[PDB]
Amino acid sequence: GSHMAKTVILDHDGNKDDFVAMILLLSNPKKVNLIGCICTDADCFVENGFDVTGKIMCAMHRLIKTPLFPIGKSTATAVNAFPTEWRFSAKNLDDMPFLNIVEDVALWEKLKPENEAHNGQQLLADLVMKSKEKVTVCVTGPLSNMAWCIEKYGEAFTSKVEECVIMGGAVDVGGNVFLPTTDGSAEWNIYWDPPAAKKVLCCPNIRCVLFSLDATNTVPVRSVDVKGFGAQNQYLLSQMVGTMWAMSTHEEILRDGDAYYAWDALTAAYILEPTIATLEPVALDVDVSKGKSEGRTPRASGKPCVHVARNPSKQMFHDLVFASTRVC
Amino acid sequence: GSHMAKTVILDHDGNKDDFVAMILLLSNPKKVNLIGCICTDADCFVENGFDVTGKIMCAMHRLIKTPLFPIGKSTATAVNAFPTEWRFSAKNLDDMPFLNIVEDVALWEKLKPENEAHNGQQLLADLVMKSKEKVTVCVTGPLSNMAWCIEKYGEAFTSKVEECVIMGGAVDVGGNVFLPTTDGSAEWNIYWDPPAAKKVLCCPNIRCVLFSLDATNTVPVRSVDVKGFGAQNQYLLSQMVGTMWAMSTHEEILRDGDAYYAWDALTAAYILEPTIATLEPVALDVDVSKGKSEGRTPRASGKPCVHVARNPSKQMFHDLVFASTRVC
Ligand SMILES: Nc1ncnc2c([C@@H]3N[C@H](CO)[C@@H](O)[C@H]3O)c[nH]c12
Ligand SMILES: Nc1ncnc2c([C@@H]3N[C@H](CO)[C@@H](O)[C@H]3O)c[nH]c12
Ligand SMILES: [Ca+2]
Ligand SMILES: [Ca+2]
Ligand code: NI
Ligand code: NI
Ligand code: NI
Ligand code: NI
Ligand code: NI
Ligand code: NI
Ligand code: NI
Numbered sequence: 093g094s095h096m097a098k099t100v101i102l103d104h105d106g107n108k109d110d111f112v113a114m115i116l117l118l119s120n121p122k123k124v125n126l127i128g129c130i131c132t133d134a135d136c137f138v139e140n141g142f143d144v145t146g147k148i149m150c151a152m153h154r155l156i157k158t159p160l161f162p163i164g165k166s167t168a169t170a171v172n173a174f175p176t177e178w179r180f181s182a183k184n185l186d187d188m189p190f191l192n193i194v195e196d197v198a199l200w201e202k203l204k205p206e207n208e209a210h211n212g213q214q215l216l217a218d219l220v221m222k223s224k225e226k227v228t229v230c231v232t233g234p235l236s237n238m239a240w241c242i243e244k245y246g247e248a249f250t251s252k253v254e255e256c257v258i259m260g261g262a263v264d265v266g267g268n269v270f271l272p273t274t275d276g277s278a279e280w281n282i283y284w285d286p287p288a289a290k291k292v293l294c295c296p297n298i299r300c301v302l303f304s305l306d307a308t309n310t311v312p313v314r315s316v317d318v319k320g321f322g323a324q325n326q327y328l329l330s331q332m333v334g335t336m337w338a339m340s341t342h343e344e345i346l347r348d349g350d351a352y353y354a355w356d357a358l359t360a361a362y363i364l365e366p367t368i369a370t371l372e373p374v375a376l377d378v379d380v381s382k383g384k385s386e387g388r389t390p391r392a393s394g395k396p397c398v399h400v401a402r403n404p405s406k407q408m409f410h411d412l413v414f415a416s417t418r419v420c
Numbered sequence: 421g422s423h424m425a426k427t428v429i430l431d432h433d434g435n436k437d438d439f440v441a442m443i444l445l446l447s448n449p450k451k452v453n454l455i456g457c458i459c460t461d462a463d464c465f466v467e468n469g470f471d472v473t474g475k476i477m478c479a480m481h482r483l484i485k486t487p488l489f490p491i492g493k494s495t496a497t498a499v500n501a502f503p504t505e506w507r508f509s510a511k512n513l514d515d516m517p518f519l520n521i522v523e524d525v526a527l528w529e530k531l532k533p534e535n536e537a538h539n540g541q542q543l544l545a546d547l548v549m550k551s552k553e554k555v556t557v558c559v560t561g562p563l564s565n566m567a568w569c570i571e572k573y574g575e576a577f578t579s580k581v582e583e584c585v586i587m588g589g590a591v592d593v594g595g596n597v598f599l600p601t602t603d604g605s606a607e608w609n610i611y612w613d614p615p616a617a618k619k620v621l622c623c624p625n626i627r628c629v630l631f632s633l634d635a636t637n638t639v640p641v642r643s644v645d646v647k648g649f650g651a652q653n654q655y656l657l658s659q660m661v662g663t664m665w666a667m668s669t670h671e672e673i674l675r676d677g678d679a680y681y682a683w684d685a686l687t688a689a690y691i692l693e694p695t696i697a698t699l700e701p702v703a704l705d706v707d708v709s710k711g712k713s714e715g716r717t718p719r720a721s722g723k724p725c726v727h728v729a730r731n732p733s734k735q736m737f738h739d740l741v742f743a744s745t746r747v748c
Contacts, residue, residue: 180670187643187669189662192650315515322520334517335663341515342508 097125099225100363103216105134105233106141106182108336111148113232113360115329116412118152119419123364128219130212132166132233134284135174140182146200146207147191151328154195155420160203162219166212168236171285190331213240217249226254230363232356234281239288242295255299259359260289261389262305263374263400268350269387278387279305282378286387290378294397303359307369307401311358311409312351315341320414329417358404361412368408371399425453427553428691431544433462433561434469434510436664439476441560441688443661444740446480447747451692456547458540460494460561462612463502468510474532478524479656483748494540496564499613518659541568545577554582556691560684562609563588567616570623583627587687588617589717590633591702591728596678597715606715607633610706614715618706622725631687632717635697635729639682639737643669648742658745686732689740696736699727
């Protein structure tokens with residue numbers, strides 16, 4: 093009652109924080125048996141995110157013998173697209189020396205054609221439904237794949253979900269989608285596909301834990317913390333996460349306080365440490381209009397939709413990330 | 421006639437290629453005795469450029485016992501600043517795990533106060549005038565510091581320069597300065613301070629070797645090459661340079677063919693291997709006007725100003741970069 097790992101699927105969209113989330117889950121096999129990953133063409137170009145997922149999988153398998161697992165490119169399409177500039181980060185990671193260790197590249201090239209054949213939405217449905225135990229789905233991209241599963245299979249899928257831990261939305265704080273067509277009240281993961289997020293977030297048959305901006309604002313990614321990885325540069329996982337975070341520490345300056353946060357990574361951290369945040373049940377009325385408020389997740393004007401994460405512990409997050417990135 | 425290392429100062433502005441340049445020079449003590457570095461607040465924020473210069477110097481000193489050396493922040497200011505977004509690269513590098521190894525960070529905090537007192541321009545003049553050998557000055561940022569020295573000390577300075585190997589200009593090809601007020605004909609290093617450039621490039625008392633876009637267009641930083649560093653991830657210098665390049669391989673897509681190149685690195689490569697390119701003597705009419713063609717370096721309607729690098733060897737560049745990055 094403590095020695096059995098949770099079965100987990102990571103449903104991501106391939107930016108730096110998604111892969112830090114992936115590394116936190118995969119680096120902790122005592123707690124997490126990662127049985128598959130989905131990548132969506134949202135905050136990455138899916139082929140890049142796909143390759144990076146495969147090569148992280150292969151490196152961890154090489155170093156600490158975590159299992160290999162199916163990886164599937166979702167064919168979900170945007171309602172509203174991410175800024176193209178942000179979506180290149182998976183290509184940069186694909187080219188990094190830590191993701192081009194020769195043994196890792198060889199194994200991934202052997203495994204790629206089989207994973208190529210998967211459709212990511214069907215894979216999420218198949219992995220959950222074929223799992224012996226209930227599965228925790230960690231969603232760090234849009235909710236498009238979860239919605240597709242719910243629509244297609246209803247309770248035959250949702251009854252096999254333990255919980256869905258989700259990075260998305262903004263409840264009692266401002267959004268982070270700043271465009272001439274928007275009011276700034278929406279968060280990006282929701283904005284990408286609002287109807288998907290409405291279908292999932294208020295589906296009565298799943299437990300949704302929601303790491304909204306309310307909580308993710310507590311963990312800015314800053315230089316003074318990032319420099320910490322230097323002391324443990326001999327570990328591949330510190331090189332990876334250290335580099336991933338270092339690639340982002342200027343964004344707060346460049347965008348005038350609109351920081352890069354460890355959004356996805358904190359979300360995944362909850363799976364690893366359930367006491368890192370307290371939960372608050374909330375009813376949500378997800379805005380699916382095509383006005384300026386598109387994508388907003390305001391409290392409904394009302395039975396709870398989601399358990400909203402509150403007051404996350406910066407210190408626990410820090411200790412998990414640094415301990416995890418010393419694993420190998 | 422080959423066993424005596426050249427005496428070199430790197431006069432740079434702190435971007436990823438400036439540092440790959442610094443690395444090619446410092447990793448090859450048999451060929452190059454690096455006696456100083458100047459950093460200008462142009463394609464970086466100077467405090468970041470300064471720190472990264474120091475920590476690279478400290479890392480190489482620890483690993484292969486290359487000498488320490490003075491480093492100074494120039495007080496040169498922009499006529500036309502680099503795009504702000506580009507300038508943050510040295511902040512990202514400052515935060516990288518390979519540039520935060522405890523021993524190197526500790527040595528650099530010990531040396532920083534003494535280097536902080538230096539004035540970049542004054543340091544450049546002092547080092548050249550006090551050298552026993554004539555000094556090859558590698559310039560990979562704007563020409564502001566060379567122009568200051570030539571102006572203040574005349575022959576006192578210029579007679580102590582072997583040659584100035586400069587990244588700048590575009591002679592028979594287009595520029596890379598793409599702004600609402602410019603015609604695309606000028607190159608960034610010249611455009612940052614055109615009068616300084618005009619003062620050095622046609623200075624009758626200095627040999628200038630110019631790596632303009634004509635040559636540098638041969639060495640785009642491309643994923644298929646960058647992925648090679650993975651095979652060398654055990655060497656610190658391949659982690660640095662592989663990461664520096666992998667941070668930039670997306671730019672060719674992002675700016676629709678306007679690629680990231682190994683501009684400054686090829687410039688330094690010439691100092692290491694003079695047969696990497698051939699030289700053509702060319703008189704230049706550097707444009708200092710405030711219109712569309714500000715910063716252009718056209719052929720003049722004259723005695724040679726510079727010796728322009730031509731048809732650089734892509735293969736020799738590759739072999740030198742990959743050999744140098746296995747040094748430690
Ligand atoms: N500036 C930025 N650069 C790259 N990615 C992102 C995101 C992505 N969307 C979620 C948080 O809004 C989280 O899943 C991020 O991966 C938001 N802002 C970003
Ligand atoms: N896109 C870009 N990102 C970052 N830096 C640069 C430069 C800098 N200017 C010179 C080439 O024009 C070279 O010395 C570079 O360091 C040009 N384009 C850049
Ligand atoms: Ca994400
Ligand atoms: Ca430069
Ligand atoms: Ni147990
Ligand atoms: Ni399969
Ligand atoms: Ni710590
Ligand atoms: Ni600003
Ligand atoms: Ni000799
Ligand atoms: Ni001094
Ligand atoms: Ni384009």
